């Protein structure tokens, strides 16, 4: 029932994501010279280094907020892809499955801790 435990759990999961080869394109911002139409399609850029910095700054209140930003990484890749068969999109999809498999217990434990706190 540790209301703060999500934060280190999210740090460790980001560490796992950074070790995954599938995270390569999503570790830093899209260079808008190699992909100059990017901001015509994507309103809100997001990458894993921005997620990790936000977490480390103390600017997430909850793991739900971190989860929203990580899902934005994936939705941006789906919106920008020219094909459902693209190399970066297909990595986006496997990384998403990995992230959702690992974040489910972090969210569940947080929300249970906050329910216990307010019991
Ligand atoms: C400095 O080194 C960097 C920094 C960032 C990157 N990332 C990068 O260019 N991206 C291309 C667009 N994108 C897609 O989701 C996507 C779907 C289909 C095609 O692209 C996100 C990833 C690469 C090298």
UniProtKB/Swiss-Prot annotation:
UniProt tissue specificity: Expressed in myeloma and epidermoid carcinoma cell lines.
Phosphothreonine sites (modified residues): 44
UniProt modified residues of type Phosphoserine: 90
Domain Bromo as annotated: residue spans: 1-106
Localization per Swiss-Prot or TrEMBL: Nucleus
Record note on quaternary structure: Interacts with IRS1 and IRS2. Interacts (via bromo domain) with acetylated lysine residues on histone H1.4, histone H3 and H4 (in vitro).
Disease / disorder: Chung-Jansen syndrome: An autosomal dominant disorder characterized by developmental delay, intellectual disability, autistic features, anxiety, hypotonia, obesity, and dysmorphic features.
Purpose of the protein: Probable regulator of the insulin and insulin-like growth factor signaling pathways. Stimulates cell proliferation through regulation of cyclin transcription and has an anti-apoptotic activity through AKT1 phosphorylation and activation. Plays a role in the regulation of cell morphology and cytoskeletal organization.
Protein name, as recorded: PH-interacting protein
Organism: Homo sapiens (Human)
Gene that produces this protein: PHIP
Coverage span on the entire protein: 1316 to 1434 of 1821
């Amino acid at each position: 029932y540790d209301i703060q435990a999500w934060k280190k759990q999210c740090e460790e999961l980001l560490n796992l994501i950074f070790q995954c080869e599938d995270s390569e394109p999503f570790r830093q911002p899209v260079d808008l010279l190699e992909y100059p139409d990017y901001r015509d399609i994507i309103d809100t850029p997001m990458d894993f280094a921005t997620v990790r910095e936000t977490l480390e700054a103390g600017n997430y209140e909850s793991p739900m907020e971190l989860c929203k930003d990580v899902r934005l990484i994936f939705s941006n890749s789906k919106a920008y892809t020219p094909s459902k068969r693209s190399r970066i999109y297909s990595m986006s999809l496997r990384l998403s499955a990995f992230f959702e498999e690992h974040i489910s217990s972090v969210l569940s434990d947080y929300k249970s801790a906050l329910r216990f706190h307010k019991r």
